[PDB]
């Protein structure tokens, strides 16, 4: 249900580059550049951007190609 930023940090195992991919991803949702693949959970843009990292729908090369 809610965002799980604890287990998502264990997949990449960096906890420092995860917020870098989440910053450029959450900025595209607020400006309206791209539509999120996962359905909206009636939350802010900073929450949906963290759930897409653990699901594997977005990545460093995926977010770079969308811009």
């Amino acid at each position: 249900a809610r965002v799980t930023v604890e287990d998502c940090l264990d997949n990449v195992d960096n906890r420092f580059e995860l917020v870098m991919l989440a910053t450029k991803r959450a900025r595209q949702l607020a400006t309206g550049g791209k539509e999120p693949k996962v359905a909206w959970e009636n939350d802010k843009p900073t929450v949906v951007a963290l759930r897409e990292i653990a699901s594997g729908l977005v990545d460093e090369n995926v977010v770079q190609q969308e811009d």
């Binding site: 917020v19 989440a22 802010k44 963290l50």
Partner: protein, 202 residues
């Protein structure tokens, strides 16, 4: 403000008075009234938040749903002094705190005053949800022992539960499962500490 213990709060959230959330998040309220279409001029939205109408309390709970705030005591000696929390609107003039995180803050409910901070940019909101969150800094920076260990009051309640009496009411009985053993305790036919024989599923 003055701290206050709250037992009905989750670990990843805290308390916040309505009078403080309206002043700390003042620029955020003006952004939702203009985007919705209620007040086109920023001057008309300022007169609405001061009168505290019923419509302002609707957008105040909407802007504050997943925006974490910072809490820290006046003296800070380690990194656990600054821990981000999720504010929940309460009624009063005190800032509620979780009872389990008081061991890290090194503060007691005897008149201690803690600070508060509000991040603004999008980069700061993602920072308070990855490293400074209350659910991430469980282990102590000195040793591997957790700092969220049950405190004095909750341990006392758990020590009385895990006891063994020589003679008690409902001794020698056999229970099927944990759900069937709890049903007999609430009915009054079984004591809290009595030698029984139950079957578990681990």
């Amino acid at each position: 403000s003055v701290i206050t213990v709250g037992p009905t709060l989750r670990l990843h959230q805290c308390g916040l008075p309505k009078k403080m959330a309206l002043e700390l998040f003042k620029p955020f309220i003006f952004g939702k009234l203009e985007g919705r279409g209620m007040a086109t001029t920023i001057k008309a939205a300022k007169k609405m938040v001061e009168r505290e109408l019923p419509e302002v309390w609707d957008v105040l709970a909407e802007v504050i749903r997943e925006h974490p705030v910072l809490l820290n005591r006046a003296p800070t000696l380690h990194r656990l002094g600054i821990q981000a929390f999720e504010p929940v609107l309460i009624e009063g003039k005190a800032i509620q705190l979780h009872p389990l995180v008081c061991a890290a803050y090194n503060a007691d409910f005897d008149g201690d005053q803690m600070a508060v901070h509000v991040p603004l940019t999008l980069e700061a909101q993602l920072e308070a949800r990855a490293l400074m969150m209350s659910t991430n800094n469980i282990l102590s920076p000195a040793n591997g022992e957790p700092i969220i260990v049950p405190s004095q009051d909750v341990v006392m309640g758990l020590y009385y539960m895990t006891r063994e009496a020589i003679n008690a009411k409902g001794e020698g009985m056999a229970f099927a499962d944990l759900q069937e053993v709890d049903r007999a305790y609430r009915s009054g036919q079984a004591s809290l500490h009595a030698r029984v024989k139950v079957r578990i599923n681990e």
